[PDB]
Amino acid sequence: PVLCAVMNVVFITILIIALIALSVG
Amino acid sequence: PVLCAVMNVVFITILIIALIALSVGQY
Amino acid sequence: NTASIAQARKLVEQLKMEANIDRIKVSKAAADLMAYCEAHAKEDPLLTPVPASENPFR
Amino acid sequence: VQLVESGGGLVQPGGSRKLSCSASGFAFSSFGMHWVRQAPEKGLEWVAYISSGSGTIYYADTVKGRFTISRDDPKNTLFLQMTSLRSEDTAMYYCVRSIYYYGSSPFDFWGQGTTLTVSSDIVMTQATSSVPVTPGESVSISCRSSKSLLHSNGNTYLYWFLQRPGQSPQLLIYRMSNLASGVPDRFSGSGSGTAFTLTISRLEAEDVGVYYCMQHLEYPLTFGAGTKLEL
Amino acid sequence: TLSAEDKAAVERSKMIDRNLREDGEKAAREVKLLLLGAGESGKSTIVKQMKITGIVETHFTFKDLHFKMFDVGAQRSERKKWIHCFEGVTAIIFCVALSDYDLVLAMNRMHESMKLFDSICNNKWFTDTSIILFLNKKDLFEEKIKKSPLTICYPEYAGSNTYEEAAAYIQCQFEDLNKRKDTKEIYTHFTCSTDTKNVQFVFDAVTDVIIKNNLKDCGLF
Amino acid sequence: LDQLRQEAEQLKNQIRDARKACADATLSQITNNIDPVGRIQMRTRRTLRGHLAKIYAMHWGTDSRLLVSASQDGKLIIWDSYTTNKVHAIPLRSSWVMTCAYAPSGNYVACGGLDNICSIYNLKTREGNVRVSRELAGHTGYLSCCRFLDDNQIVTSSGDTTCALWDIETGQQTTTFTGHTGDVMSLSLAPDTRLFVSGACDASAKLWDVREGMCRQTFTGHESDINAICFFPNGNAFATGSDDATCRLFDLRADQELMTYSHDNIICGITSVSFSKSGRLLLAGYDDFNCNVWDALKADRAGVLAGHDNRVSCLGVTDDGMAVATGSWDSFLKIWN
Amino acid sequence: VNYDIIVRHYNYTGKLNIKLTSVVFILICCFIILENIFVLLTIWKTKKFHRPMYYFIGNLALSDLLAGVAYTANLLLSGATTYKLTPAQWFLREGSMFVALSASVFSLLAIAIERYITMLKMKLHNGSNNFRLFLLISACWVISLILGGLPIMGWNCISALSSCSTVLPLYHKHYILFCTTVFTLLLLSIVILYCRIYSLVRTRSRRLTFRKKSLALLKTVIIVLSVFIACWAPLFILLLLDVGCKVKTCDILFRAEYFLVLAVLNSGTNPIIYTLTNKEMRRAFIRI
């Protein structure tokens, strides 16, 4: 659905944020 | 469609595995 | 008038036709209904759930 | 119902040509359209297919890249833009109507054909290219496939066509048992996966011709070698 | 895992889905109006105002709105058996003859119109569908009240028998027949068989109903 | 006049006395040693999306696979219930459709509604589209139900307080069944198609003869109008659905009511009834968005098929009894077993 | 990157040490949490299961719930006891609070955008347009997460000490001016959108002409804009006077906990407005 698409987008986004956070950490 | 969805799933798995590797190893 | 008598006697003849019918006993009628329901109970895919092998709707 | 093709003639090897079939008498935008060709002394052979709405296009492996199929729905025309012709590429090109839904009869109507002269798959096998006929029999021919045509739906996508001498091929039986609208009850189909049989009863004329068995399980749709019967 | 024919069947199904969605989007931008009112109420004048048995469908257009009017008074059946087919209309045009305040069916035609309006305005299906009340025969009502009193229809009436305040009294009666005032609105108009402001009034009332519907849609109302 | 009225009163009392004289024991007193059907669990196997308005009727094909459904967006859609494909989508000339019917041979569909005409669409044409074969006009009220006898005869029921038997080839009524006093809301054909019953808006179902045109019997007992009616598969009993939250099972040979299917929890009208294949189950669609599954011999169930978000306006079982399809005003057909 | 950096940063701000404000703030905050749960379950409790105009009140309720839980996490872990936290945990806490508030403001903008689009296109029958719900809600959550994670992704004050904000020690100052600029842009966009909605409704209702409201809309618009400005703009002017003044002379700061609790009170009073003004869902909200 659309809620699940938004959920996948926010999950991949928080994953990229964690990835850059480890890249600086 | 289905090819873009499979590519997105593969990219999500690659990001998760890269995060797991950067958590195990270091830079 | 004329239409009143026409409608009244139409109802009268219709009920005369409806009253001269052979009635069987309600016990016999319900016995026939339950005999039909028991004779065909195996071929009822909603009564007895059919296995998913031969169920066309999975 | 009319399918009339145009664009034939003679072409030197190489180059280009455009075949066009004008459709009249049916809802052209609802039917998928096929191009099948027939060499001068050979059987039928599938060439191309465009869906309804042009959303799906297939070609034969001996044709892909050189040809282009296209349809013009408001003009009720079907086009075959063929480039880089070869000497083997000469044939009579038929335009074939085909509609696909549950219980439909695709390949039911065929065009008249235009002669064109040039100066892994499923193998369908016919028994013998000729069957003798003496008055007072009931002929029964066979067509053995090289793959189980019985899909998991229960359908068995094998068709039977009739081509009268100097005529266009006519659908007889679709999905191996369902006889098309307008054919007598003489023609009957039977068999199993990889084994099929067309049974004719009560011998008469008008059934003289070459009988082709086509499969429709997957593309490309491969015909059979044809089976002539004469007397 | 589908065969060669099943894929083409699914493709035909998807084209059919596409045409159904196109037809739905085309039929969603069209006002659906329902004409009601007793016989000889002058709704023939209203269906003639457009100037561009069973149910009768009148398609007319205006300043960027396509209207469809459904004259249902032709068929006589139990109205409660098919009135739920119109529970999604935009408005309800209700024609009432002002000149029928003294005529009798042998009862009173104005009372029959009021009973029908009471039955339709407070129906459980049109619980928020607004009503566009037309009051036809205003000039005939002028001459009739110039000759005959209004007390024959409303004995409880006590005002002076003149056109303006008696017309206001009739409108007040019809609007007081509205049990549900929080959800629906009644846009009264004193039409005649002469002028062409009727389509303008229908357009204005439908535009107001569209504004209220959008306000209720996006939370505000 | 008074002699005719008193004669009708005495004759109604004679009919009532004859109906009481044959009621030796009720159906509960005789179907008491029957082990119950247990709990009937049905799940939505299919959900057919594509209608954009309230679905008003449906009808299965005789091959138990193809549907037809009429909604008030002006579309007759013919589904392939096994794969949810839409075989055809017929645009109606009048979007106010209240019924549909699939011919027993599969060649035709029919539909009608507030336009008073019963249009008959030809499905298997040579030019590959579905075109109106006939428009049967002659009713003066809305057409509420229609069933095919064969490819040439269709019987309709309208709000003219009358039913009629048409000849499709000519286009004119060969028989008009009169005798009701309210809007005829539904009919149901016999398995041998020699008789049919019709339920009207006067709380009475009448058993008609197709070849003769006369009303054989009349069945009273409902407190309100009858919105739906179906036959027991045996052909000599039928169930009626009324607006007083009550199904009743009448019998043709006993000429009276056998059993009433009601529940104190249920206060909403009934829009559609249908028996199962063996007749043991009596499905009934209600106004409270549900679809209760009654035991036709015990009358002791409410086995809910709750899947809809609006009034279940139509339902029907397949000819092989394999599935139950219910259509509702929420524009979705669901298929149950 | 040890604790010495957070200690020396607090030394750079002078917030070093060595209250009932916490208990009243957690009272206000659990009130916010409970009303958020109420307004969020009400969407699930009713038949609003599809409701494409809804899910926006749901997103606002969800982000307000996250603002509540983030304010609990901040208040329980703030004060002189904060020194036991690592820079990672500190960045995590502050970024959580910022992503909560930014998600609230962006969801409010999404509500205003959907309302303006619905008001512009008259759209006689209800329109779903799920392709736009995805874009709006995903943009809300993604941009809020970006603004909350910009500190933890390196853009911070661990490199140069001169850019230190005395309200948030480890935070970069240019990041704070950028975040408050984005907040001001969102505020201006929301007010412009609602004023244009009112203009559209007023002119369209004025064009009509019949004898037998628009001012009822002005009440809703003015109370929405009023609570939004009155409970968010103090933080805007606070951070503006922080960034645009000399260092260590802004003694009127250090009471930002009251500013933070009023800014989260904004989020907490949003759902009571968006469920009391909407009578359709107030019908669904029968009792507590």
CSV table of N, CA, C and O in Angstrom, one decimal, chain E residues 143-186:
chain,number,residue,atom,x,y,z
E,143,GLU,N,-52.4,36.7,-9.1
E,143,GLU,CA,-53.8,36.9,-9.5
E,143,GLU,C,-54.7,36.2,-8.5
E,143,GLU,O,-55.7,36.7,-8.0
E,144,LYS,N,-54.3,34.9,-8.1
E,144,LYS,CA,-55.2,34.2,-7.2
E,144,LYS,C,-55.3,34.8,-5.9
E,144,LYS,O,-56.4,34.9,-5.3
E,145,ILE,N,-54.2,35.3,-5.3
E,145,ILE,CA,-54.3,35.9,-4.0
E,145,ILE,C,-54.9,37.3,-4.2
E,145,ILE,O,-55.5,37.8,-3.2
E,146,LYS,N,-54.9,37.9,-5.4
E,146,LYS,CA,-55.7,39.1,-5.6
E,146,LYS,C,-57.2,38.8,-5.6
E,146,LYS,O,-57.9,39.7,-5.2
E,147,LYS,N,-57.6,37.6,-5.9
E,147,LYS,CA,-59.0,37.3,-5.8
E,147,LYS,C,-59.3,36.4,-4.6
E,147,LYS,O,-60.2,36.8,-3.8
E,148,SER,N,-58.5,35.4,-4.3
E,148,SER,CA,-58.9,34.4,-3.3
E,148,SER,C,-57.9,34.4,-2.1
E,148,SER,O,-56.7,34.6,-2.3
E,149,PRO,N,-58.4,34.2,-0.9
E,149,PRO,CA,-57.6,34.3,0.3
E,149,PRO,C,-56.7,33.1,0.5
E,149,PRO,O,-56.9,32.0,-0.1
E,150,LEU,N,-55.6,33.3,1.2
E,150,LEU,CA,-54.7,32.2,1.6
E,150,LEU,C,-55.2,31.4,2.7
E,150,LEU,O,-54.7,30.3,3.0
E,151,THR,N,-56.2,31.8,3.5
E,151,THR,CA,-56.7,31.1,4.7
E,151,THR,C,-57.2,29.7,4.3
E,151,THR,O,-57.3,28.9,5.2
E,152,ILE,N,-57.7,29.5,3.1
E,152,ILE,CA,-58.2,28.2,2.6
E,152,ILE,C,-57.1,27.2,2.8
E,152,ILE,O,-57.4,26.0,3.1
E,153,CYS,N,-55.8,27.5,2.5
E,153,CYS,CA,-54.8,26.5,2.8
E,153,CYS,C,-54.3,26.5,4.2
E,153,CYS,O,-54.3,25.5,4.8
E,154,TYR,N,-54.0,27.7,4.7
E,154,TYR,CA,-53.5,27.8,6.1
E,154,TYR,C,-54.5,28.6,6.9
E,154,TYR,O,-54.6,29.8,6.9
E,155,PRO,N,-55.4,27.9,7.7
E,155,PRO,CA,-56.3,28.6,8.6
E,155,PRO,C,-55.6,29.4,9.7
E,155,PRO,O,-56.1,30.5,10.1
E,156,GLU,N,-54.5,28.9,10.1
E,156,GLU,CA,-53.7,29.6,11.2
E,156,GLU,C,-53.0,30.9,10.7
E,156,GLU,O,-52.4,31.6,11.5
E,157,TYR,N,-53.1,31.1,9.4
E,157,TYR,CA,-52.5,32.4,8.9
E,157,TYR,C,-53.3,33.6,9.3
E,157,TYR,O,-54.5,33.5,9.4
E,158,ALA,N,-52.6,34.6,9.7
E,158,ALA,CA,-53.2,35.8,10.2
E,158,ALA,C,-52.7,37.1,9.6
E,158,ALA,O,-53.1,38.2,9.9
E,159,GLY,N,-51.7,37.0,8.6
E,159,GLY,CA,-51.2,38.2,8.0
E,159,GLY,C,-52.1,38.7,6.9
E,159,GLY,O,-53.1,38.2,6.6
E,160,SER,N,-51.7,39.9,6.4
E,160,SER,CA,-52.5,40.6,5.3
E,160,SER,C,-52.3,39.9,4.0
E,160,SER,O,-51.2,39.5,3.6
E,161,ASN,N,-53.4,39.7,3.3
E,161,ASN,CA,-53.4,39.0,2.1
E,161,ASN,C,-52.8,39.8,0.9
E,161,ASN,O,-53.5,40.3,0.1
E,162,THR,N,-51.5,39.9,0.9
E,162,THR,CA,-50.7,40.5,-0.2
E,162,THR,C,-49.7,39.5,-0.6
E,162,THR,O,-49.4,38.5,0.0
E,163,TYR,N,-49.0,39.8,-1.8
E,163,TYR,CA,-48.2,38.8,-2.4
E,163,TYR,C,-46.9,38.5,-1.6
E,163,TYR,O,-46.6,37.4,-1.4
E,164,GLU,N,-46.2,39.6,-1.2
E,164,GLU,CA,-44.9,39.4,-0.7
E,164,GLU,C,-44.9,38.6,0.6
E,164,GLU,O,-44.2,37.6,0.8
E,165,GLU,N,-45.7,39.0,1.6
E,165,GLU,CA,-45.6,38.4,2.9
E,165,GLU,C,-46.3,37.0,2.9
E,165,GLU,O,-45.9,36.1,3.7
E,166,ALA,N,-47.2,36.8,2.0
E,166,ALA,CA,-47.8,35.5,1.9
E,166,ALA,C,-46.9,34.5,1.3
E,166,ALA,O,-46.8,33.3,1.6
E,167,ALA,N,-46.2,35.0,0.2
E,167,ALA,CA,-45.1,34.1,-0.4
E,167,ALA,C,-44.0,33.8,0.7
E,167,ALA,O,-43.6,32.7,0.7
E,168,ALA,N,-43.7,34.8,1.5
E,168,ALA,CA,-42.7,34.5,2.5
E,168,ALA,C,-43.3,33.6,3.6
E,168,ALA,O,-42.5,32.7,4.1
E,169,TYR,N,-44.6,33.6,3.8
E,169,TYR,CA,-45.2,32.7,4.7
E,169,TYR,C,-45.2,31.2,4.2
E,169,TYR,O,-44.9,30.3,4.9
E,170,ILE,N,-45.4,31.1,2.9
E,170,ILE,CA,-45.4,29.8,2.3
E,170,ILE,C,-44.0,29.2,2.3
E,170,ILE,O,-43.7,28.0,2.7
E,171,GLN,N,-43.0,30.1,2.0
E,171,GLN,CA,-41.6,29.6,2.1
E,171,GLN,C,-41.2,29.3,3.5
E,171,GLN,O,-40.5,28.3,3.7
E,172,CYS,N,-41.7,30.0,4.5
E,172,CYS,CA,-41.4,29.7,5.9
E,172,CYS,C,-42.0,28.4,6.3
E,172,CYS,O,-41.4,27.7,7.1
E,173,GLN,N,-43.2,28.1,5.8
E,173,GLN,CA,-43.8,26.8,6.1
E,173,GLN,C,-43.0,25.7,5.6
E,173,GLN,O,-42.7,24.7,6.3
E,174,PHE,N,-42.6,25.8,4.3
E,174,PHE,CA,-41.8,24.7,3.7
E,174,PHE,C,-40.4,24.6,4.4
E,174,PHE,O,-39.9,23.4,4.5
E,175,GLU,N,-39.8,25.7,4.8
E,175,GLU,CA,-38.5,25.6,5.5
E,175,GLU,C,-38.7,25.1,6.9
E,175,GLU,O,-37.8,24.5,7.5
E,176,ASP,N,-39.9,25.3,7.5
E,176,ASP,CA,-40.1,24.7,8.8
E,176,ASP,C,-40.5,23.3,8.8
E,176,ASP,O,-40.6,22.6,9.8
E,177,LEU,N,-40.8,22.7,7.6
E,177,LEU,CA,-40.9,21.3,7.4
E,177,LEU,C,-39.6,20.6,7.5
E,177,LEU,O,-39.5,19.4,7.2
E,178,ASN,N,-38.5,21.2,7.8
E,178,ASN,CA,-37.1,20.7,7.8
E,178,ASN,C,-36.7,20.3,9.2
E,178,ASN,O,-36.3,21.2,10.0
E,179,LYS,N,-36.7,19.0,9.5
E,179,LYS,CA,-36.3,18.6,10.8
E,179,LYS,C,-34.8,18.7,11.0
E,179,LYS,O,-34.3,19.0,12.1
E,180,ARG,N,-34.1,18.4,9.9
E,180,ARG,CA,-32.6,18.4,10.0
E,180,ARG,C,-32.1,19.7,9.4
E,180,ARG,O,-32.1,19.9,8.2
E,181,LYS,N,-31.7,20.6,10.3
E,181,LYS,CA,-31.2,21.9,9.9
E,181,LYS,C,-29.7,22.1,10.1
E,181,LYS,O,-29.1,23.0,9.5
E,182,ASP,N,-29.0,21.1,10.7
E,182,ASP,CA,-27.6,21.2,10.9
E,182,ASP,C,-26.8,20.7,9.7
E,182,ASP,O,-25.7,21.1,9.5
E,183,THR,N,-27.4,19.8,8.9
E,183,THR,CA,-26.8,19.1,7.8
E,183,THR,C,-27.1,19.7,6.4
E,183,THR,O,-26.2,19.8,5.6
E,184,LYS,N,-28.3,20.0,6.2
E,184,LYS,CA,-28.8,20.4,4.8
E,184,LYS,C,-29.3,21.8,4.8
E,184,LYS,O,-29.6,22.4,5.8
E,185,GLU,N,-29.4,22.3,3.6
E,185,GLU,CA,-29.9,23.7,3.4
E,185,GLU,C,-31.0,23.7,2.3
E,185,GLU,O,-31.1,22.7,1.5
E,186,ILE,N,-31.8,24.7,2.4
E,186,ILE,CA,-33.0,24.8,1.4
E,186,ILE,C,-32.8,26.1,0.7
E,186,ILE,O,-33.0,27.2,1.3
